[PDB]
Amino acid sequence: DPLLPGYSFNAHLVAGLTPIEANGYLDFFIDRPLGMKGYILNLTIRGQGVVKNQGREFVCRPGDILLFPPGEIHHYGRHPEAREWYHQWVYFRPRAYWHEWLNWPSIFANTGFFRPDEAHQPHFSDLFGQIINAGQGEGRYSELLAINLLEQLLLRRMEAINES
Amino acid sequence: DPLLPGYSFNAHLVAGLTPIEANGYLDFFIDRPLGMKGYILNLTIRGQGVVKNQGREFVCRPGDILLFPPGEIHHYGRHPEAREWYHQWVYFRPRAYWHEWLNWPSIFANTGFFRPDEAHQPHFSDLFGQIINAGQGEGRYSELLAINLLEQLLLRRMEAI
Ligand SMILES: O[C@@H]1[C@@H](O)[C@@H](O)CO[C@H]1O
Ligand SMILES: O[C@@H]1[C@@H](O)[C@@H](O)CO[C@H]1O
């Protein structure tokens, strides 16, 4: 189960939805102090989460997208004053030419943040969901599609931030 | 105007819609007898076209997707029995790893053909429209986005067959 400790993330893209509910089986903090081998993109869809990094804390809310590069600390979970923290996520290894699009302004350390304009929220949420659906497919082209959709999301962000 | 002959198609992706109407300004056959350097994907969205190749003819209708690889003859226009032939198209240079997804069954010579089933039709039409939108947009990422959406279409076809 990728939603619980013990799972091995390495070369393959893995995607899912973590529906944390207070006092439930997922009500614990993701705690990977040494970081991961690949990247993780995280979209909050309901509730609130608290992201911690060496004494600092950041409250993420529905519509916020976070970026965790390889080696970066992962220490986040349901915000103590929130009933839940539902977040979609995708673990991945980038294609070579994606690096310009992985340069996001940090909330702290090297943990990136992106929040689409309210008007664009629906598209990004829908796109993120398409990534999960593809990521969890078993077809010969499932992973390739998930990777492609992720690339689309990174490009849509590039257009979004440069819209003016 | 890429819609008119003499346009220089080279390394940049170019996309558009050619709304051919009988007797209108676009009512002529595209004719590139020695082909092009890049690929062209073509989706018919209205009316009917006639694709020709050294005497042979193929009538394409709404929902038909054709693939013209580099060097392939381009000779096509409004079908004589149709009042129009609106087709969306995208000229491109592929990413290296796309080649395994570009070997489509051919109507003749090496002109590929793909007709999504009725269930997949709306999604592919929707996707092609997004390609044209991205390809015609302004900014430093319009072309990359179009390339991205194109790769998606290629992958959805592989998945659909
Ligand atoms: O819930 C977590 C998710 O936030 C991401 O870190 C991947 O692993 C899952 O277990
Ligand atoms: O209308 C054509 C189109 O079909 C494609 O060949 C690109 O060039 C345009 O002029």
Best residue for ligand 2 mutational test, from B17, B20, B30 (most atoms within 8 Å of Cβ): B30
Q: How far apart are CA B105 and CA B158, in angstroms?
A: 13
CB atoms within 10 A of CB B55: 6
CB atoms within 10 A of CB A1: 7
Range of the domain at A162: 1-164
- Resolution of the entry in angstroms: 1.5
Distances (CA, A) of A106 to A65, A100, A160: 12, 15, 17
Residues 6+ apart with CB under 8 A from B109: B53, B54, B72, B73
Q: State whether A155 and B145 contact (CB < 8 Å).
A: yes
CA B117 to chain centre: 18
Residues 6+ apart with CB under 8 A from A35: A68, A70, A71, A72, A73, A74
Domain total of chain B = 1
Best residue for ligand 1 mutational test, from A31, A40, A88 (most atoms within 8 Å of Cβ): A40
| Strand ordering across the sheet containing A49-53 | A30-32, A74-78, A49-53, A56-60
Mutate to test the interface with B, among A99, A159, A162, A163 (most CBs of B within 10 A): A159
Distances (CA, A) of A133 to A42, A43, A82, B27, B119: 15, 15, 27, 43, 18
Residue having the nearest C-alpha atom to atom 9 of ligand 2: B3
Spell out where chain B has E strands. Answer: 14-21, 30-32, 39-47, 49-53, 56-60, 65-68, 74-78, 84-92, 106-108, 111-114
Q: How far apart are CA A9 and CA A29, in angstroms?
A: 17
∠ CA A36-A37-A40, nearest 5°, is 60
In contact, A149 and B152? CB cutoff 8 Å? yes
Write the residue in A144, A148, A162 that is nearest to B139 by C-beta.
A162
In contact, A9 and A16? CB cutoff 8 Å? no
Method: X-ray
Quick one: which H or E segment has residue A66?
strand A65-68
B104: CATH: 2.60.120.280
